[PDB]
Design a protein around this ligand. Structure first.
Ligand SMILES: Nc1nc2c(ncn2[C@@H]2O[C@H](COP(=O)(O)OP(=O)(O)NP(=O)(O)O)[C@@H](O)[C@H]2O)c(=O)[nH]1
Ligand SMILES: [Mg+2]
Lengths: 614, 205
RNA sequence: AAUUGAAGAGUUUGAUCAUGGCUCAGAUUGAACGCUGGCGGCAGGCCUAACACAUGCAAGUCGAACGGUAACAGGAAGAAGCUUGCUUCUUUGCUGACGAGUGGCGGACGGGUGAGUAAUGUCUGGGAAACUGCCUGAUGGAGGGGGAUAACUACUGGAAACGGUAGCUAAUACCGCAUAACGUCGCAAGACCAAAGAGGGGGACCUUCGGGCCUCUUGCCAUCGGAUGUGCCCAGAUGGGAUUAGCUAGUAGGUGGGGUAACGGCUCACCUAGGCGACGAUCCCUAGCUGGUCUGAGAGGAUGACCAGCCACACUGGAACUGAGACACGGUCCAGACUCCUACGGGAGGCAGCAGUGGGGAAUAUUGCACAAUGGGCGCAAGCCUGAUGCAGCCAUGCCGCGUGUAUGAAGAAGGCCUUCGGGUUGUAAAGUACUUUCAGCGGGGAGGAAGGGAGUAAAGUUAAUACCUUUGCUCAUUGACGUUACCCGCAGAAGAAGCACCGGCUAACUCCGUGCCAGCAGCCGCGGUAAUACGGAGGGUGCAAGCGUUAAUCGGAAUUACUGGG
RNA sequence: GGAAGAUCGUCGUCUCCGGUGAGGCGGCUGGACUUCAAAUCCAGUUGGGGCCGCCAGCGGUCCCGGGCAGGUUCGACUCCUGUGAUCUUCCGCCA
């Protein structure tokens, strides 16, 4: 129940705070010194009842209003002061429009200066307030007429403070904290105080400070002048933290948050809500909770917009914010973050309807989640950062049927199979380049399909194809079951006329490679694939023999152990007279096959199947 | 800690059969070992004295697969030892438990020996241990844990060990793949091809 | 067995060899910056401002010293509600216990800093003219009295701080008396000096019925020792500067007095005029010293963080007393400055202790836990206290260990790079096949640190006593902050894990593209002027590896201050 | 954060400028340009984005541009009232 008071200067805001408490908001020395709200002052009223209400006095200055925009973050209920003396004012209407754009859940009207002026003036200010409340659509409000000098309003207000529901938020979110006021008490640590927009933190927690980009242990925390071991979001949180970082490095608008941020983004898609129509590509002040910014807006078809900061800044999805004119004064429109890094070329016709599908069709993070998985890989860290997912929230994607989950992005099974089918047709085209092959190798395929796409997602998708049984593989080559190795003609047109000739007698490659005119490396395809047929062998790459010579060379080699009792080379020469060169080459041939072993003078033959069984 | 990289390229930078990996083959050589250690390995640099001695020290440190710092530690302690520095150095360098696991024959590679010792499979003097860098004690038995038994690879490497000839200074009964180290080998009983003194003067700067 | 141990290069010129510096390859660090980062063990973690410090903690403890009951709980008489033996409340130190007060001891140890200090120090090796509480050995004493007072009570001051007036009381508090030599003085003879009791049990035996009595325990006094520690002295050793050569008057001795626990110009009076020194006095500058640490082959050189000892210091300048022990880090008093409160009269405080903040800076930790263990103060003891310590948290800061997978695998793919376009190359690399699950995760099992001590026990000793007390065994239970410990057994899948520098030569490792003495590289000699093996990028290779690289400082190379070891 | 200020052409700097912006200088590019540096003159220094079609963070096309706007005025780089950012200085920096 933080409850901020708001309104124009000298409506008695601080006076109201003394009325309820007799204690004050003003903490900065200059305001003490000058008797004013130079800057946002905070006050808290700890109680035996155990609530501490949070009072926030804010400047009515338009010039200081950008600071008020820093202070309207995290309000649970709002009390807009209106003085019976001065009455309703256009600035009051401005503060109401600003809180309406912030989507502040509820508000209370409190008339002040009642005794100071005659009752007819009281009724006038009453009527003017009753007119003004109807404009922004908030309905219930408890108007209180009182003089603080009289105390008339105390009882009805005190009940009213307790009446307000607290705005609970879901436990499963990464913790996030907006730095506001740095000051270091001499006792232990920095203590940095800020509104916690989401998630939960406790005194033992380590938190990731951005910019310095380092974890920092929490030394202590005080929830709201109510010291405790833990701090929940939705309240200002004094948060004392260990760390090497010091206040001189710290600046307002630095972020404290649970997880290492995605890098700051100038571009952002944002929801437009407007009291009056705006215009494309113009400078304005962006105001988010505890954030004062300047940047230029751009229009994206109709009430869809992209903000372009010239100063990149971290932000996250579904953070409500108000957009004001760059010169200050006029407040013109609200905004909400919807997409944080829209792709370039976003304006082409088919796509905008689909972006509308990503956002208008889906309110829930899960529905937007499914749309993004349908679009392509969802790096869970980024999308999760936009939704501030906790691990229990991370489980929702596992709950989703049909999604192919690699180490990050899911992919829909039917849609996965669709993308597979496209890659398969390309793979069929490679199968057309050589239908004799069972198929393309895997690494060439990964490069051939979608090189930009994630290795975890792609390899897992190939595993899904293996589970389908669509990809059977042998010798490490992955192929479709259907291929019959019909024989591609690019091989065959030389192989047909060459085959009986090379068949019927061995011939060296070059000896009639010139007669065919073929290049040597060009034959280091056709001939090795003929070796894949198992017909023509190669002792050496340049010369190729038919199997039928090699089999005879084997049977004459077989005689060494039987005729000699030794595997001496000499019988190849002692029988048919075959030369030492080609014979030693046959020896390297079986050695590379692993068909025979070398030891000392002679070959061991511990495993070959060719040797006659007896 | 382990080198984690292709093996026979480091082996073929020198063109020798470094036995870093063998498996079904004793050596490949069919990978064009002596010709292309690198992009300019087709031409052979003549390599100055510091480069040849350093290159040999690199080669041997690679065949035993040790990192440079504790390698130099082996050097400095070996110099602290009495007697010939190169000799006792090489002997204690063979004292590494993984090398002993390879020479005992159960192990496809000395790196694989680091694997199997890391997996608790070894059992020395009735106690499990993991440091392959450890130097086996004289006349000390070493055994493999009975749960380590069943892997087919170990014995299949023993059939390779038989072909290797195996060192005589260590006595592996091999009837229970539990061998005993005996004593640190003398320079006379082994190698006579590698030349260890290169390393010691290479550190003598 | 106590060692085993020493390498050069580049650069002067047209070229040579010398002389000679300058530069590099090595090692090391209380390092830093940047890049990078998976885990574990062991270490270390303000060298800057002896600069300024909030808040909390670090020094208390004994009723077995005394008077008491402030608080808590029993018990006691009584209240006597009612739930008629459940509860009601007054009084009750009478018991367990204890606030505060008096008294005993601690607080002079423990820890931090190295400012000062060039000698009042520290080290080595000696010496006489000393003291030493509590521990311990021998030795004897220990009897008999008085007068006070804090606390407390009433009065009263001052904003607070802190008192003040009056009155009451005990003590192992104080002060007397007696007492005494192996004590001190005295050549001697003689003279003179000390005090405390308390606690535990207990038969007989005295009981003003408080107590007395026996016995035991422990305390007190006295004297000589022992150990220990401390003081004092001796000679040498322990930085630089001679563009510092003259220096000193209570300073050099003498007598007497004074003074110290003790020698002594330590001090005073008086006499003498000496006294120091080129073997460097005085003066100036700098500095904590040593064991030791790095480096070196060695000799040397530099250094003296952490560990250990000694000295010196505690915001600054000072001073003195109490005390066995101080001119006293959390004692006192004076002065000053710096901060804080005040009713403005007056007051208060000192992290160079453990944490912590700020500042400085290139820059270095938890306002964490426990006395569980060791150690210490008090206590008979139990226990109390301990930021010593035991630990943990944080950091790749350093050392050490491991992993980021294994084996096989040629259809040696594609891509990249290159090419003579011949083909190489990346590469068994990949894929596949067959394995593996270290550690982490998850789940179990599960040490030693824990010795003692409590209660009781039997027995012994002691004793008038089978008691008490003492000792030895035994039974019971019990003592863990660390600790979800160490360590071990399961689960599942390579699942969670490789970077950084360099590639002209010195110096290991090269091609293309881009650029064109530009932009830029650079420890040194050097490169770049349109085809750069030196710039920038790619590919490839080399070197280190959970680390990698430039800078910071010392030694080494430097035999280039040359005793070893130069002209 | 507050109290004040200056700054943010069109390659840079300047005098500025109420006349359709003008000029000077400097740095570099190209002509003059020397065995090189140097000189003094000339021409120029494409800015920013919007929108569109490619993968081409590029082209094509359009529009605006002296920080961003407005008020003024016949005419604003100019003058004037503000206002944003960076920059400069003092004060403030309380679980
Ligand atoms: N007599 C009387 N005076 C009142 C009453 N309520 C308010 N006031 C007057 O209101 C004046 C204070 O106004 P103030 O609190 O400054 O208004 P603010 O809106 O808080 N100013 P800021 O914008 O700076 O925060 C007081 O001086 C007081 O005299 C009332 O009930 N009676
Ligand atoms: Mg106010």
């Amino acid at each position: 129940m933080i409850i901020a008071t708001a309104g124009h200067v000298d409506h008695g805001k601080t006076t109201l705070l003394q009325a309820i408490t007799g204690v004050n908001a003003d903490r900065l020395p200059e305001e003490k010194k000058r008797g004013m709200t130079i800057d946002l002052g905070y006050a808290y009223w700890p109680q035996p009842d155990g609530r501490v209400p949070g009072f926030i006095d804010v400047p009515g200055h338009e010039k200081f209003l950008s600071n008020m925009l820093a202070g309207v973050g995290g309000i649970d209920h709002a009390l807009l002061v209106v003085a019976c003396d001065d009455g309703v004012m256009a600035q009051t209407r401005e503060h109401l429009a600003i809180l309406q754009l912030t989507g502040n859940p509820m508000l209370t009207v409190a008339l002040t200066k009642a005794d100071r002026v005659d009752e007819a003036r009281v009724d006038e200010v009453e009527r003017q307030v009753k007119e003004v409340l109807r404009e922004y659509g908030f309905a219930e409000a408890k108007l209180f007429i009182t003089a603080a000098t009289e105390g008339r309003g105390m009882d009805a207000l005190r009940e009213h403070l307790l009446q307000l529901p607290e705005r609970e938020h879901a436990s499963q979110h990464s913790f996030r904290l907006a730095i506001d006021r740095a000051f270091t008490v001499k006792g232990a640590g920095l203590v940095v105080t800020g509104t916690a927009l989401s998630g939960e933190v406790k005194v033992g927690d380590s938190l990731w400070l951005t910019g310095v980009n380092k974890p920092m242990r929490v030394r202590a925390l005080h929830a709201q002048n109510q010291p405790t071991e833990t701090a929940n979001a939705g309240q200002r949180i004094a948060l004392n933290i260990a760390g090497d970082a010091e206040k001189e490095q710290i600046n307002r608008g630095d972020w404290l948050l649970a997880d290492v941020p995605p890098e700051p983004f100038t571009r952002v898609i944002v929801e437009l809500q407007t009291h009056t129509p705006l215009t494309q590509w113009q400078p304005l002040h962006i105001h988010h909770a505890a954030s004062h910014v300047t940047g230029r807006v751009s229009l994206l078809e109709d009430n869809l917009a992209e903000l372009v900061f010239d100063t990149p800044l971290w932000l996250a999805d579904n953070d409500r914010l108000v957009l004001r004119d760059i010169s200050a004064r006029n407040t013109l429109a609200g905004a909400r973050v919807v997409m944080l890094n829209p792709p370039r070329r976003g304006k082409r016709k088919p796509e905008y309807l689909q972006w509308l599908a990503s956002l208008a069709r889906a309110q829930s993070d899960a529905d937007a989640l499914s749309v993004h998985l349908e679009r392509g890989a969802v790096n869970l860290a980024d999308f999760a950062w936009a939704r501030q997912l906790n691990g229990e929230g991370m489980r929702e994607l596992l709950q989703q049927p049909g999604y192919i989950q690699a180490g990050y992005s899911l992919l829909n099974a039917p849609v996965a199979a669709r993308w597979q089918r496209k890659i398969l047709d390309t793979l069929a085209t490679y199968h057309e380049q050589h239908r004799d092959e069972p198929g393309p190798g895997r690494e060439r395929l990964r490069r051939m399909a979608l090189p930009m796409e994630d290795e975890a997602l792609v390899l897992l998708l190939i595993e899904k194809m293996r589970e389908s049984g669509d990809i059977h593989s042998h010798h490490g080559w992955l192929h479709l079951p259907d291929h019959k190795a019909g024989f591609s003609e690019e091989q065959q047109a030389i192989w047909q006329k060459a085959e009986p000739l090379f068949g019927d007698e061995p011939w060296w490659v070059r000896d009639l490679a010139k007669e065919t005119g073929t290049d040597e490396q060009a034959m280091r395809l056709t001939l090795r694939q003929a070796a894949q047929q198992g017909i023509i062998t190669a002792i050496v790459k340049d010369r190729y023999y038919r199997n039928d010579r090699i089999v005879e060379f084997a049977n004459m080699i077989r005689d060494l152990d039987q005729e000699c009792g030794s595997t001496c080379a000499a019988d190849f020469r002692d029988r048919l007279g075959v030369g030492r060169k080609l014979a030693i080459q046959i020896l390297e041939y079986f050695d590379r096959i692993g068909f025979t072993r070398r030891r000392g003078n002679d070959h061991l033959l511990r495993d070959a199947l060719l040797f006659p069984e007896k | 800690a382990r080198y984690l990289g292709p093996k026979l390229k480091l082996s073929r930078r020198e063109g020798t059969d470094l036995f870093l990996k063998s498996g079904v083959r004793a050596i490949d050589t069919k990978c064009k070992i002596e010709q292309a250690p690198g992009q300019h390995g087709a031409r052979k640099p003549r390599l100055s004295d510091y480069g040849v001695q350093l290159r040999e020290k690199q080669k041997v440190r690679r065949i035993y697969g040790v990192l440079e710092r504790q390698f130099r530690n082996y050097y400095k302690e070996a110099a602290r030892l009495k007697g010939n520095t190169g000799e006792n150095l090489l002997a204690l360098l063979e004292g590494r438990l993984d090398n002993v696991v390879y020479r005992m024959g159960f192990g496809a590679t000395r790196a694989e020996a680091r694997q199997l010792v890391s997996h608790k499979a070894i059992m020395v003097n009735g106690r499990v241990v993991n440091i392959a860098s450890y130097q086996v004690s004289p006349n000390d038995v070493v055994s493999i844990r009975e749960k380590a038994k069943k892997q087919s690879r170990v014995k299949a490497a023993l059939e390779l060990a038989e072909q290797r000839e195996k060192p005589t200074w260590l006595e592996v009964d091999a009837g229970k793949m539990e061998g005993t180290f005996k004593r640190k080998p003398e320079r006379s009983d082994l190698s006579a091809d590698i030349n260890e003194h290169l390393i010691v003067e290479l550190y003598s700067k």
